[PDB]
Design an enzyme around this catalytic site. Sequence first.
Site, PDB file in Angstrom:
ATOM      1  N   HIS A 116       0.701  -1.257  -0.104  1.00 57.44           N
ATOM      2  CA  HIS A 116       0.050  -0.127   0.262  1.00 57.44           C
ATOM      3  C   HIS A 116       0.911   1.149   0.101  1.00 57.44           C
ATOM      4  O   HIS A 116       2.169   1.195   0.158  1.00 57.44           O
ATOM      5  CB  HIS A 116      -0.870   0.104   1.352  1.00 57.44           C
ATOM      6  CG  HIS A 116      -0.258   0.484   2.483  1.00 57.44           C
ATOM      7  ND1 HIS A 116      -0.019   1.764   2.908  1.00 57.44           N
ATOM      8  CD2 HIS A 116       0.597  -0.311   3.368  1.00 57.44           C
ATOM      9  CE1 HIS A 116       0.587   1.796   3.944  1.00 57.44           C
ATOM     10  NE2 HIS A 116       1.102   0.650   4.293  1.00 57.44           N
ATOM     11  N   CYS A 117       0.430   2.353  -0.152  1.00 61.27           N
ATOM     12  CA  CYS A 117       0.850   3.851  -0.041  1.00 61.27           C
ATOM     13  C   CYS A 117      -0.129   4.517   0.338  1.00 61.27           C
ATOM     14  O   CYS A 117      -1.127   4.139   1.064  1.00 61.27           O
ATOM     15  CB  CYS A 117       1.386   4.036  -1.516  1.00 61.27           C
ATOM     16  SG  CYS A 117       0.295   3.930  -2.978  1.00 61.27           S
ATOM     17  N   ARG A 118      -0.271   5.930   0.138  1.00 61.59           N
ATOM     18  CA  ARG A 118      -1.324   7.077   0.422  1.00 61.59           C
ATOM     19  C   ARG A 118      -2.697   6.634  -0.150  1.00 61.59           C
ATOM     20  O   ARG A 118      -3.685   6.249   0.413  1.00 61.59           O
ATOM     21  CB  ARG A 118      -0.845   8.237   0.204  1.00 61.59           C
ATOM     22  CG  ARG A 118      -1.752   9.417   0.750  1.00 61.59           C
ATOM     23  CD  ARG A 118      -1.598   9.485   2.243  1.00 61.59           C
ATOM     24  NE  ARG A 118      -2.788  10.396   2.982  1.00 61.59           N
ATOM     25  CZ  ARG A 118      -2.672  10.794   4.046  1.00 61.59           C
ATOM     26  NH1 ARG A 118      -1.559  10.866   4.974  1.00 61.59           N
ATOM     27  NH2 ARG A 118      -3.436  11.684   4.411  1.00 61.59           N
ATOM     28  N   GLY A 120      -2.831   4.174  -3.008  1.00 64.99           N
ATOM     29  CA  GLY A 120      -2.818   2.747  -3.796  1.00 64.99           C
ATOM     30  C   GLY A 120      -2.973   3.074  -5.020  1.00 64.99           C
ATOM     31  O   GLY A 120      -3.412   2.412  -5.966  1.00 64.99           O
TER      32      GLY A 120
END
Length: 178
Positions: A116-118, A120
């Site tokens: 994940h990231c901020r 996605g």
Amino acid sequence: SVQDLNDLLSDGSGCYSLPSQPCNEVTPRIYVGNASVAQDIPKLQKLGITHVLNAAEGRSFMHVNTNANFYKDSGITYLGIKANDTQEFNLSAYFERAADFIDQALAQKNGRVLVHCREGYSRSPTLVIAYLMMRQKMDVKSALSIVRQNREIGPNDGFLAQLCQLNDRLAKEGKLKP
């Protein structure tokens, strides 16, 4: 060519849809999500997630401020990469380490990983695409198409160019499946 990759992500030119859901399983046992799914430990357990790869680790509004400590005692394994979603950030330097982490989760039949990231949308989908190329021998176009069909993504042109360099390396040395 980066423009042939953007063409697969947009409806022709100009517009790129945004994620309609906070999390999607893009390929079996590999999930791509955002900041809030990453911080909902009870949801991760319900899904049976064993490993979390945070590709936006940091203390700003474009990052998710989690650490191994946030996941300790829940039995979740953690790896964080402090990446910035810019065309100048060299995410390719982390491809191998990311591909290794995902391989370690999937090596056990019960493993499931959340990359994940901020949002996605740009940082994490790039690591998943790279993994599909390096470990499952798919070419960039096929790898990108599979993820996109399962989640609205839009990696920045600099990340797309790094993926194109990777594609050439692998194919020159005869590692991609036709």
